[PDB]
Each structure stands twice: as C-alpha cells, then as structure tokens.
Symmetry: C4
Subunit: 388 residues, 4 copies
C-alpha cells in the first residue's frame, strides 16, 4: 500500500447526487441503536465509513437521558462501514467527546479527545495503536474538527482549538506522521475564530472551511501548507454566508478578510469548496435554526467579495425538517478527486421535548458531473413513535 497524495485535479461538478442514508432514528424505535451526535464520513482507498460520537448508550435505554450533560467520559468514537447503522456490534474506536479521523493510504489515524473540560487529553491512534498524546494548552475544552482530517504523502494535518467559544481562542494546526506529532503551527492570517474545520485536500496543500463562533456568520478559511507548515486564513468571499445564525441574504455581507459581525455569535459546523472563482457550499435553509439543508454554487463566491449570484441550488432536507452539522469528505476517482458531504439530522432535544434524549441520523451526497432531479431526504422518524 502507498501513501495518498491526492494529486489529481478536482472533479468538475454540476451539483450533488444521493449517496447514503442511515435511517438511525427510525430504526431506534424498533431495535437497539446507539445514541450519537457529531457524525462524519471518511473513506479508505476502497470504501467509506461513517463515524459519530456515541453517548455510551442506546436510544431505547434509560441512560439515553444522559445527553443533557456535556462531554461525558462515556462518549466514544463509533466507526462502521457507511450505511451500516450504529447497532450493538459497532466498534468503539477510542474514548472521545471530540474527534477527527483519516486514512493516509496505509492506515487509519484517529484523533480522540476526552477528559476534564479544563484539562483534556487528545490521543493519537494510528494503525490500531496509541502513538502520541497532547494535553490542553489553554485549559478550556481542547477540541477538534468533528470531520475527516487530511493526509498527503504520509503527513496528516488536523486543526485543533483550545480556549473560549465566544472570544479569542488558541487554534493550532498539527502535523502527524504515522500517529506521531512532528510539528505544530499556530493559526495565522485574518480568521479571528476557528471551530470545527471541514478540511479537504487541494494538492499540494489542505484547505479548511470552518465555524466562527464569535463575530462571524461568514465562514473562515484556513489554508495549510504541507511543505513548510505555514498557515494562512481569511473568510469565504460569498455574500451568501454559510453559518447559522446569519442575516437574511439581502443584508448579509462578507469582505473575504474579517468576520462580518452579523449575528456572528454561535454557529454550526459546515463546509464549502472552491472551483476557480466559484464556490460550492451548503447551509441550513433557516437563517436562525438548524432546520433544512440546501446546496448551491455561488458565481464568484471564492474570488469576489460579497458575491450573491447563485445557481444550481438543491434542497437536501426541506425546511420542515431538522438538520445539524455538515462536513466535507473527499473521494479519489480514476482521474479526479470528488467532493462529497454529509448532513447530521438531529432529533430530540432541544427542539423536540416529548423525548429526553438527543440523537441523529445522517444523509450523504456526492459530487456529480452528470444530471439529477429534486427531493428531500430528512430523518423521517415520527417523534410520537419514539421511546422517551
């Protein structure tokens, strides 16, 4: 087996086609299924896997009310082949209330963070063994991407933050070789707050679109140079911004450089990617709630500040249904690298108070150069049919 280089051009896409759906919550009403949140997808050279952070319990289980507590020690990273729901035979890969995973072409790396809020531990597990660990540097919830990391030529990179979720924090970019941290670079550039980066290979480097939880409803961009470990950062140019909450399209702004200070506090994990001057992106349909999901291309969305001309819109989840986190993953084809994404479909609390638990299912779409129609692929569980 050879290391992945991702040294193929990006696939020229026309939109996205349906790829996978796990129906987790529907199944939870008639079977033993893990309570989860913060899912993601990552593929080895042959096939894709779904990941999520378990809550140390199944849904039809009195322990499912534990989701009211943050970052419990029982949270573990779950890993299954994509489309296999999180049943009781699911492997718990590590202890984690925040994680990132990626395959370097030879083996899996898992970054798993657990322990006390003020003194967390990140474990680095490669090829089935613990290779390294790092402690909290700002004593305030050491945390990572909640989506796939990216490896080029045997060096994997992952973005981590420690510090305030509502003010200046300490973001660092780690470079990892076979599980061993070989370099750490501080965040540099004009991004002022970085959470939950959605990263993708853009040979020879890595590009991340993240969540500003402090002053921006425009999404920050982090650019990682894999040759010399240098970091740059800015904000997505698009005037159609990607965060939730955000302003209406008619009053939203981005200048590519600074947080827009428009309903900037809080946010949701999301993604976008460049194609020349243009931008492909997803976001919730609701401006203030994690409801619905849509994708579109913004003409000049990458290069032109405040660009608002969209095309190729697709509804993924209609606005009568709950969404959640979303993130990118990349899949190597015969001649190009394709971009795909997943959407977390959150059910239960806080939005649905009949039940005491919070959990999710997922839906997954992949880039296509072909054609497609329309639809909506929500979680689909009837809240009234669920164990409370």
């Amino acid at each position: 087996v050879e290391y992945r280089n991702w040294s193929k051009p990006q696939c020229q896409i026309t939109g996205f086609a349906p790829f996978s759906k796990d129906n987790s919550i529907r199944l939870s009403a008639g079977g033993d299924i893990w309570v989860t949140r913060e899912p993601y997808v990552s593929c080895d050279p042959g096939k894709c896997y779904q990941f999520a952070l378990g809550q140390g319990t199944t849904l039809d289980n009195k322990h499912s009310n534990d989701t009211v507590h943050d970052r419990i020690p029982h949270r573990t990273l779950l890993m299954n082949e994509l489309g296999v729901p999180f049943h009781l035979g699911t492997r718990q890969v590590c202890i984690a209330w925040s994680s990132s995973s990626c395959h370097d072409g030879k083996a899996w790396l898992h970054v798993c963070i657990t322990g006390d809020d003020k003194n967390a531990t990140a474990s680095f597990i490669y090829d089935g063994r613990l290779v390294d660990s790092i402690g909290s540097w700002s004593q305030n919830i050491l945390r990572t991407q909640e989506s796939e990391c990216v490896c080029i030529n045997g060096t994997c990179t992952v973005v981590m933050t420690d510090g305030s979720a509502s003010g200046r924090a300490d973001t660092r970019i780690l470079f990892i070789e076979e599980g061993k941290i070989v370099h750490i670079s501080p965040l540099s550039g004009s991004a002022q707050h970085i959470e939950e980066c959605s990263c993708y290979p853009r040979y020879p480097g890595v590009r991340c679109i993240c969540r500003d939880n402090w002053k921006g409803s425009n999404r920050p961009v982090v650019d990682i140079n894999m040759e010399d470990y240098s970091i740059d950062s800015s904000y997505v140019c698009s005037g159609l911004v990607g965060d939730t909450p955000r302003n209406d399209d008619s009053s939203s702004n981005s200048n590519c450089r600074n947080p827009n200070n428009e309903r900037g506090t809080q946010g949701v994990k999301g993604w976008a990617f460049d194609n020349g001057n243009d931008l492909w992106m997803g976001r919730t349909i609701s401006k203030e709630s994690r409801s619905g999901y849509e994708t579109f291309k913004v003409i000049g969305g990458w290069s032109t500040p405040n660009s608002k001309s969209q095309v190729n819109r697709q509804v993924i989840v209609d606005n009568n249904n709950w969404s959640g986190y979303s993130g990118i993953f990349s899949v190597e084809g015969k001649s190009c690298i394709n971009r795909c994404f997943y959407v977390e479909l959150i059910r239960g609390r806080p939005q649905e108070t009949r039940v005491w638990w919070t959990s999710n299912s997922i839906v997954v779409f992949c880039g296509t150069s072909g054609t497609y129609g329309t639809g909506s692929w929500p979680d689909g569980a009837n809240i009234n049919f669920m164990p409370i």
Copy 2:
C-alpha cells in the same frame, strides 16, 4: 481480477433445485428485521448476495405503517450475503426506491433511484464511490430493473423507463463502464411497454424478459447488442404467458411480436430464458393474483408462436400461499453458465389486512442437470403472530 465475459454455453437443465430461503417474516415476529420489498439476487465471482429495498424501518416498529406511501425518501438498497436475513447489521448500499446491481468481475455497480416522482435521480455507484448520475427524462417515475444488471468485458447494461405505467413510456438502455455512462440507446423493436426487466448474459449479448404493464399479458423481450449498442425487442412466443393478470391457458395467446391485449393492464415482474427453440419460465399459479409460483419448460416456447405444450413443471410455492416479484440471476460454473431465480413472498397489505405493513421474504432456486422431487416453500409466517 479480470472482467466477466460470460463466454460459456448455457447449462443444459432438467429443472430447478432448492438453493436458499431467508424466512424473513417468520423471524420478524421474534427479532429486529427490516421491512422490505423488491428483492433480488446477484453473485460476485465467489458468492451470492441478496438485495432488497428497505422501507427505512424494521417490522416490529411503529414506522412499519409507512409502507402505505409509495417511494419514500427513506428507502435504501440493502445488501447481505445470500441467506443472511436483513438484520440491523445490514449495510444500506445507497438511497433507492428502485434499483439494479451487478458485479463486472472486478467490482460492484449499483444503480439507485430516489427523489421526487416527477424529477428523480439515478445514482451510479461503482467500487464504493459515486461515479455518475442522471435525472428523469420524462418527469414520471424514473425506474429500473429491480434485479441484477449484466456486465460483459467491463461494460454493464441496465434497462430504465420513465413515463406512464399505463400507456406509452420512454424506455432507454444504458451502457456503463466502471460506473460511467458511456452510451444510452432508446428502446427499438415491437415491445410496446417495458417494466422491470429480468436480464441475463447470452454471450455476446444480453437478453431481458420484462413486464408489459399496458396492453400485454405476454412478456416483452429486449435484446441488447453489447458490441454496437443496438436494441431489438419483441414478445415471448409461448402461448402459456408469464404475466399476472392473464387469461387462462385455454384462451391465452402470444404472436411473438405484439402485446396480446388479454388482461394486459398491470402485471408483475417475472422472468424466462431460452434454450434453443424451448423456453424455461416461471409465473404465479393464480391467473389473477400474486398467489403461488410454478416453473416449467415450454416446448417451442421461444420459437413457435402460441406454443402451449409444457413439460417439467415444478411447484415452487403452492397456490394457497402468496408470491410476488420474481427474477433471474446467472451463475458461472466450471464449463457452463447456470440460470437461477428468486421469488418474492409478499406478506401483509393489500392481501392481509390484520397488519398495516407490507413486507416480504424470499425463496431461491437454481438450474440443475440432475434430478429432483417436489415440495412447496412459502413464506411460512402466521399472520396472527405478527406485530400489526
């Protein structure tokens, strides 16, 4: 691994021997089992797999009443080794309310259709990644085989239809190489309505026996030329016709060219294959309902219009028990290509109204050159024991 060519003669069979049964509905009364319909079987060069369209729920689950709705976004293609029932560890391969799958000798292709009735999307997934997609061309339930596609020398073919289920529609034959659509041929010849083709390799080409849902109780034939992409079509010659509904044996007709206009509207997915001038075929025992299943050879059933002399009858499911869809699959042996078939055994609605759900189990038989006896292998569940 090399591409399949299927370039061996067809096995000379005397009838069929029992191969597999999954007992899905019986198990559903005492375990967590997926609600399904439209099952089929396809084998890689080593082993066979069972497929079905899930309804995003298990049977003992309040969501099982969702089967009243057509083409829900929660339908996914399920895939297990043949004989492994659809338990909660089953992989959902893609999002699909219509599908076809096949292995080209190197990897699996799945064709998965989902989305809105008037604007559906077909996704083409090969070797675990999305390679292509196509949108609806007639804005009226883009749909496909519900059984295995066929690949010769790395080119897979699949039959798709879009348009009316009760009048002239737009049927197209797709040619797919490693998941990429390389050519699309319109239907040609005298078949006037094509649904749910059961296709098989007949080197150097592919032959399909389908369902005419409009004017014929005789089954259409589609012949696919894999060398130049040309298409021909007609009707099975046999005066013993394969569709349900149909006339009784004394008043049924086929002229090999046109739909017979005998109880022609509606139908059921089924299969047949040629052996020289003769025809092996299956059908429901009832002429009006999806009850029972029988196979036999029709002497001159391929070459002689209105041929009605049968031999080698076998009851697969007696007429006191429900059947459903049936389809062909092909299995390469040491020196010949064998033909096998599955029968869908539908339980629940509309025939059994004690329950709200509709689901199925399967029974599977394979061609034999040896000898065999008699029996009946129905679903076997007691409807009174079932969750409603």
Copy 3:
C-alpha cells in the same frame, strides 16, 4: 490451496478435553436466537464451524411452536464459526431438513435435503453454487448424515438413505467431486440398517459409525474405499453398545456382524472410532432416554466380539441433564489427525412440556494426548425462565 488428503496417522489419545460450548438456550431467554436441532461441527483447514438445522424461527417467537411438525419447508442449514451462537446475523446456507457439510481443502460442500417426504430433493452446493441435485430413490424421506462428510484428494463421500426407518431401507454412498456426483455405490456387507452416519477419514479410506434404527442397539460400521468405490459394512464389536435404547451392560451383546436384536428399534445418532484393537466411543448415560453423556475406551472394542472391559471413562453431561445426537469430526494437527466430538443438548419437548418448542445447545470436546480432570457441561438453562 491444496486438497485435503488426511494422510497423517491418528493422534494417540488418552481421552478428551473441553473445546467449545455455545449456551444457546440460556442465551435464548435474553436475546434473539435460532430454534435448531441436529447440530454438527466441521472445520476448514484454519478453523471450526458449527452447523445446525434451523426451524425458520427464533426461540422467543410465537413461531417456535412449529417444531411439533416434522421436516417443514422452512428448515435451513445454519453455519457460524464455532462458539458463535445462532444469532440473527447467522447465514442460512441452504434449505435443508437433513444435511451434511465438509471442506475439501479448497471449498465447502453442503448436501441439503428438502421437500416432500415421498419426493425429496438433495441439493449439492460447492464453493457457493449449486452444482448437482438428486431426487428420492425410494420415495420415503431421502436423508443424510447430520454430521460432516469426508473428502480425500478432492473426492467427498456422503452416506444417504431412503426408505423405512423401521425396516429394510435403501442406503447409498455418494462420491462427489467439486459438487458433482461422480459415482453412487449401494450399501454392501452385513449392516442391515443405516442412519445418520458419523464418518471420519482413515487414510486411504473413510470409516463411518452409524445408527441402526431397526434391529440393532449395536452401532453399524460402514467402510468406504475411496480408490474403487467399494463398500463394506458390519457392526461395532464392543459388548458395551453405543445406541439408545439398549440393554444393560450385563445383558448387552455384539458379534461384530449382525444387529443384536436387543431393544434394536429406534436409536440416536452417535459415534465411535478405532485405535488398533481398541475402541473410543460415546453414548448417553441412560439406557433408554437421551439423558447424560459419557465417553470411554473399550479394550479390544474394535477387534474382540462382545468385549466389555472399559477404561478412561469421562462424564461429559451428567445423567440429570438432557443430551441428544452426537457425532465425530476430525481436525488435522502438525503430525497427526485428531478426533473430536460434539453433543447435542436437547431442551423442550417432548421431555420438558412447560414450553411448546424443542431446541438445543451444544458442547464440544477434542482428543488429547495430555491429562484432564472431571466435570459436567450440560445445557444449563432453567426451563422455568424460558419463553413458552
């Protein structure tokens, strides 16, 4: 991969050591577990598998009362790694109410019999495909070993019977190459009734110890010549006889040649094997009921008519607990071929009438050249804790 020849001497054993137990019935009280009977064990070159005939249902399931009926069409052969209980992810290998399985060094052969009592079908499945089939020759419950078949140099042999279970029947020995029947030899010699043979490789031939259901409580022996397909048969010499029912040890007899006519009618599947003049054998502890299980060596038990000197007795299941069928399997070691056995532990009807079902668990022991102690390894379920 090379064909198995079993061309090593037999291991020189001192008794048997515990190998495996599946706890099926205990687990059935708190989990979804298949209803089974007629289990056996067979190993590929690397590891062992447990097999059993399912009843198309789990135990905690209203369909579990179906065991009152004989040879239902829903019975299927189940196959799992040894020690994996028959959970819902278990593969159903074929449709069977009687079976035999074996690995030839390259691939698995399964012999699966199903269908009508008076007109059954035996299917022969090799390397995951149906290769051959044979119909009933005496129109009276075509049936086979219910334990492993044996292959030498790519030819597998299996013993089958058709006809009366309480009078002269028609026993035949089949020789199978890659799933294809290449020769059938009629039973020859002095054995007068043959059921459920427990066979083992004894290079260059195969030896079987079987069940006489007609006139013998001494067990018949069938010797199979793999070179020229010739058959010989007789009875185990030991005056300590292996069948149940049987006479007390003080009044039991065998002359090595004829059925003893001592409580000869009926029986139970069992095993024995030769080592020079001596015999290793198992049997129920009770003379008239399938209760308890014991093994011992009979000095001169192979060569001396009516020999009754035993040594090296071991209790496997004490006589306060139910047993059932038992059979041999052989395992290739570094320098010798070891003999192992399994015991079926039947729970439920007819002995335990609180419940309506009949099912079993298994315990497995293997030959040892070492030392060992004592114990008892019964099913262990409390009948009062079971679903009825």
Copy 4:
C-alpha cells in the same frame, strides 16, 4: 508471518493516555449484552482484542442470577475486537472459568480451564485447534492469569496455580510451543503466594507482577528465563504497595523479598512494570475496597526497598466509583515496546444489592511519551436503571 521476539527497548513513558472504553453495563440496560468478569486485553501484530469470562448468559435475562455460583460449567472465554461490546454475535473461544490468551506472531494461543474444583482441566488451543491439556496437580482449583500470556520466538509462557487461596499453594510456569507443553518449571525464589500474574515481555525474558492472596499486600514478582526455563521470584520494592486490601501509605512496607504481613490475606489482580530503578504501577484508590483506580511512577520503586516518593499520578477512576481487576498488556511500536493496561469496572453484587447479578465493563489506557490532562472514566451505569 514471523514469531514475535519483543526485542525492542521499552517505550519511555510520561504517563498514560485514554485508549478504549466499552460501556458494557450502560448498554446492557438497552440491548442484549453478555454478563462477564475477569476481562483482559491482548493484541495480535495488527490490532487489539478484548477478552472476558462469560457467565453463559446476557444481563437482561433471568439466568443473570447465576453469578452467585462460582466457576459454573457455562463460563466461556469471549473474544471481540477491542471496543466491540460483548453482544450476541461474540465468539465463545473455549470453555473457561479461568483463562489466559496470547498471540505468538503467527497464531493465537488460548489457555482455558474448566471443570470440577478438585479436578479441573486446562485446555491449550492454538491456531484454532486443541493441541494439549493438563489436569489439576493439587486438586484445588487449577487456575491461571486472567490476562495475556507472553511469547518470545515461538515459546509462550503462562503462570498457573493449584492449591490453597489462603496458604501455601503449588505454582508452576508452563512453556508452550504451538499449543504443546514443552516444559514445566516449579516456582522458585522468595514469593510465597502467586495468583493472577500480569506478565510482560522484558527481552530476553518475561516478568510478571502478581497477587499474593495469603500474607502480602506487596505484589510478588515472577521472573521467567525463556532460555533455560529457570524461575526467580521476589516482591515489588515500592513502599507504596499495589494490592487491595493494604495499609495506608504512612504504614505500608515492602522489603523486596518477603510478604509484608500487612492486611495480607485476600487481594486483587493488578500490575506494575519497571523502568530502570523506577516503577510504574496502578492500584485501587481505596485501601480496603475495589473502588477507584490510580496510576503513578514510584521513584526507586523497583530498586529501593520501601521507596515512597511518587510522581506523575493520574486518576483513572475516581474513588466514588467501582473498579476491580487490572492487568498489563504490551504493544509493539516502530522502535519500542509500549505498556498499556485495562481496568475492570465491576457492577452489581456484592457492592450493589439492588440487582442479583455481577458484571463489568472496561476502560483501557496506553503508555504515552507525550502529554495529557485529567479525568475519570468509570463504568457510568445507573444501578436503578438496570434489570435486576
């Protein structure tokens, strides 16, 4: 595949990082999970496995009250990939109420003890077959490590004891090649009572830290010479002693040679390892009960009698939560051999009498040369939510 030699230096660790947690008891309240105790971890050259002794039942099952009885014949060794909870698809590897397992680089060896207290049998299973067995030598609960054995150059060693648990016993060290016992050495040196050794490779030999159940709260050490089979034994030097019960830190003693006669009777399985003059060790936080778990390095803890200066303490389980057995396992890295440990988290009887059963979950930590924070990772189940 080549034999493991473990001929790399020990990794220089700063403490331990979180590796795995299975949440078994929490899951048992909403799923079918095995009742277990005496768990351990062992890895093949690629990945880690969790083992435990089943009680022949799931937790939500009336048979769960069987844990009141000692050493039932239904106890079997369970084996899953690390992090896969013991669901119903778990393989029971052998019959065992005491066990040890290890991989020699080519295949797994399992040592499985079962049968009567006064006459037990140890079975030795290698590469999926029974190779050897030994009977009880002292007729008083033949028993072994309950953690991984160690193999160097194809010879595996395991420590076994037979005789009194509260007085002088007969401890022997076995040397096993491909499942065959090749040599047995009696215990030699100054250790006066040996139970449940936690052993690790210390090339060219093996070192074990055990449990003195008779006169010592200091842990015995067994040194095994793999070249000439010679045995040495002593006690851990550290004045901070590892057993439970024990004296408080101000009044505990060890002289490296003799049991300390300080609350010496009874004990708990535990571990330690040397690094030069220093000692890494774990123990319960409570001095009297199996509550809490802590690790630390003792300066001069290996070489200096009664050394009590500790550094690098970590809480693994806080003292408000139940612990249990703990043991070491070793994992080969690129250039060093790492040490890891597991902690058994016992729930139910005798400490929690709302339920009748006793079971456990696990938490697992691995040596790190990096940095880390703090936390506590207890079982996490709410005893009031459990089936009784």
